[PDB]
Amino acid sequence: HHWGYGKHNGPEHWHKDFPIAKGERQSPVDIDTHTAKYDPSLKPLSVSYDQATSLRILNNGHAFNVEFDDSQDKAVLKGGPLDGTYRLIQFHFHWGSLDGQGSEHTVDKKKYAAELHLVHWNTKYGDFGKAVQQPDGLAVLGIFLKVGSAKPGLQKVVDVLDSIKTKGKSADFTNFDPRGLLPESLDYWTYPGSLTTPPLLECVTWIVLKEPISVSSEQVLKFRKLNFNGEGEPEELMVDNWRPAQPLKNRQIKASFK
Ligand SMILES: [Cl-]
Ligand SMILES: [Zn+2]
Numbered sequence: 001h002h003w004g005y006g007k008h009n010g011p012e013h014w015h016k017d018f019p020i021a022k023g024e025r026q027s028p029v030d031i032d033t034h035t036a037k038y039d040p041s042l043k044p045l046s047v048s049y050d051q052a053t054s055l056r057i058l059n060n061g062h063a064f065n066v067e068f069d070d071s072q073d074k075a076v077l078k079g080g081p082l083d084g085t086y087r088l089i090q091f092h093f094h095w096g097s098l099d100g101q102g103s104e105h106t107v108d109k110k111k112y113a114a115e116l117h118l119v120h121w122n123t124k125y126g127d128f129g130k131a132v133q134q135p136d137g138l139a140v141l142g143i144f145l146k147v148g149s150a151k152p153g154l155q156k157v158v159d160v161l162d163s164i165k166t167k168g169k170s171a172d173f174t175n176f177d178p179r180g181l182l183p184e185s186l187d188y189w190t191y192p193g194s195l196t197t198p199p200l201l202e203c204v205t206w207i208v209l210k211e212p213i214s215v216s217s218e219q220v221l222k223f224r225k226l227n228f229n230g231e232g233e234p235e236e237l238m239v240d241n242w243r244p245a246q247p248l249k250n251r252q253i254k255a256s257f258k
Contacts, residue, residue, distance in 0.1 A: 052177065
């Protein structure tokens with residue numbers, strides 16, 4: 001009986017094994033666009049993904065992760081609210097059973113169809129496992145997906161999902177370029193928060209982009225065909241793997257734009 005997204009193991013049960021679920025800096029949250037403070041001291045984000053090396057894609061039973069070689073400074077995020085260099089280690093998505101839910105973060109209570117998380121750890125700490133222990137250890141870039149037009153650069157991702165259908169499966173996934181997932185503008189809101197899965201550590205600077213990307217209905221449909229189970233236990237579709245909004249408590253959301 002370990003954690004998941006169902007009735008008996010879902011986000012509302014998490015606090016029993018992971019008490020920090022009820023903490024002071026839990027994510028995700030609702031971004032109230034009228035209460036967010038424009039802060040003109042924030043610099044533009046600097047995203048340097050030219051030398052990125054993708055290695056592998058896996059179904060870990062809660063999402064699918066595309067993993068990158070983080071042994072050197074090859075795909076890095078700097079600037080913004082960040083001091084220092086943060087290395088890309090993985091990206092993953094959260095998505096819904098239907099097009100009107102799926103994102104974790106909300107914008108004036110509006111849900112998007114999915115949310116992309118690009119996970120970066122602060123090189124000052126030397127590896128990811130030490131990073132998650134620090135208040136400034138991680139930076140995740142969150143990008144919202146709405147359904148409209150196809151995103152061509154997501155297509156290579158969708159075509160291999162057939163090969164990692166069940167929990168535990170993994171496939172070689174080289175030469176994928178994460179630039180094809182970025183929207184046009186890099187304006188953002190930022191606030192201090194947490195991982196949105198267990199262990200829910202409060203180690204994250206969140207950078208949530210204003211501009212959504214578009215994917216097609218057919219594209220998100222293929223995400224929905226994945227399984228939370230291993231081969232073949234009874235089939236449970238991997239859908240609605242999102243944690244709802246958590247209390248903002250004593251936190252300010254800052255915007256890079258007005
Ligand atoms: Cl993970
Ligand atoms: Zn995530």
